[PDB]
Amino acid sequence: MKVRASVKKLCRNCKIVKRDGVIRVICSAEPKHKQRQG
Amino acid sequence: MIGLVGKKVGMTRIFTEDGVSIPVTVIEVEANRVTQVKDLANDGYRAIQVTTGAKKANRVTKPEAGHFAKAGVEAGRGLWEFRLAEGEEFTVGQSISVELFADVKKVDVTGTSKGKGFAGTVKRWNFRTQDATHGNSLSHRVPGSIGQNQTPGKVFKGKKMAGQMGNERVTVQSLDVVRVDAERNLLLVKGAVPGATGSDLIVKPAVKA
Amino acid sequence: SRVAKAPVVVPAGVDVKINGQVITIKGKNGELTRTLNDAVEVKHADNTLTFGPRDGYADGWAQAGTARALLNSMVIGVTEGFTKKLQLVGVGYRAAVKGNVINLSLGFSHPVDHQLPAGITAECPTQTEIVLKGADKQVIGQVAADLRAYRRPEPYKGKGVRYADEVVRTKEAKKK
Amino acid sequence: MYLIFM
């Protein structure tokens, strides 16, 4: 889980979802590509 | 569970056959006669009220002697209350014996501490003394500093300072019941209980696990 | 809206009783209840339900497609039910059903026990498998996630409780 | 001796 100020899609499997008022990035193939904005 | 009211008789020792010293405190638990039973529909909470000992008939006042004559019990030296649990019921006038603690393994004993009077901060709050030598000027056992400068500019509430120590109600928890002696109204707990010899103690069973 | 406009065909012999916002469905497998949102409108028709956005509410199309799919799966649960299969991977890992309790032994120092809620009945064909029968979809899905939460699959040997329809990713350990 | 601020 990366906590940074700019979250992005790092491959073609990443998905940007807004959960509870926080922009997150969910990846189905690479658990390294997990990000939240903070 | 309800408790009983006793009297600190003093400390002694119990020798076991494997050669152990057990410091016990002797508590004379006379029978506790129930004076008044409280309920939800009249008092808002469930409790019984017990009295113990005996009082001189020329020393009981007219308000107090009428409260005992309503129950039929004889006038003891005081009145204490105990909160009932769900499933306990008692009747007015019923005497409770020391056999309440027959299979109770641990008790909590609460009493009034000894009075140390006006005690300084070295005795009361375990402060450190300053130097007894090396130049010290009239400042050996004084507290020192009691605050900071202009911010806040006041001493905080709850500051540790000299004052009245002791003579207060304290509860010592989880004492081993060593021996219950029902035929002479005794209860031997293991260890030191609060109070001087001859003071009232309230022995309730242990609430902690 | 693409989900909310395809109607739910009610099959033969399931009592669909609509009372305001509270819906009840009886059937061959059991009786289920789901209090619907205020923003959806349900109407009984010729053996077929319909869901529409109630007026005076802004997000009625989104609430309709959910209320559709939850009632679409209620009529499956009272007719054919649901199922979940959980298999155990790792030596000395075993399960056992005794009543409505599952007895898992997953390499701990104590034995663990899971009390199944009313509506789920588990059975173990093999000692390294669990089959869960249920009439609700969420409850059969949550119970399958609680047994999985005891010992989740590790990425090095695959050990732990896993679904039978779930592929576990594994990876080599770090070279010295 | 540090007698006056200076």
């Binding site: - | 020792r13 020798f15 050669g19 152990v20 010293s21 | - | -």
Partner: protein, 123 residues
């Protein structure tokens, strides 16, 4: 009650004659070391041809105290002087081969099973 700077006699044949306690091991802000407690020492005196040299920093175990130990029936066993046995820094096995004077039953465990085997008397 052994604390820091306390000079102890030595109760084995390792060669040291007086050692000084420089640390009480086994806790933060720890004050005292009774009988059976490891201490960290330094050697102040030594015989010329012993196994240890003056100035060495070793571990020890306190076997006698002038303050004494207490038994579960209230008894006390005191001694006329503080004594210890030098242990190795890491293996914590006794360096010497003999123990002098009596020791107590507080050392009776698996850690110090070799000290109460060489002891002339156990109280």
């Amino acid at each position: 009650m052994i604390q820091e700077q306390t000079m102890l006699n030595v109760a084995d044949n390792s060669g040291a004659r007086r050692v000084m306690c420089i640390k009480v091991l086994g806790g933060s802000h720890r004050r005292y070391a009774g009988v059976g407690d490891i201490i960290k020492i330094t050697i102040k005196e030594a015989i010329p041809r012993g196994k240890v040299k003056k100035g060495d920093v070793l571990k020890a175990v306190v076997v006698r105290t002038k303050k004494g130990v207490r038994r579960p029936d209230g008894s006390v066993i005191r001694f006329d002087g503080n004594a210890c046995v030098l242990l190795n820094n890491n293996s914590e096995q006794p360096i010497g081969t003999r123990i002098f004077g009596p020791v107590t039953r507080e050392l009776r465990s698996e850690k110090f099973m070799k000290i109460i085997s060489l002891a002339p008397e156990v109280l």
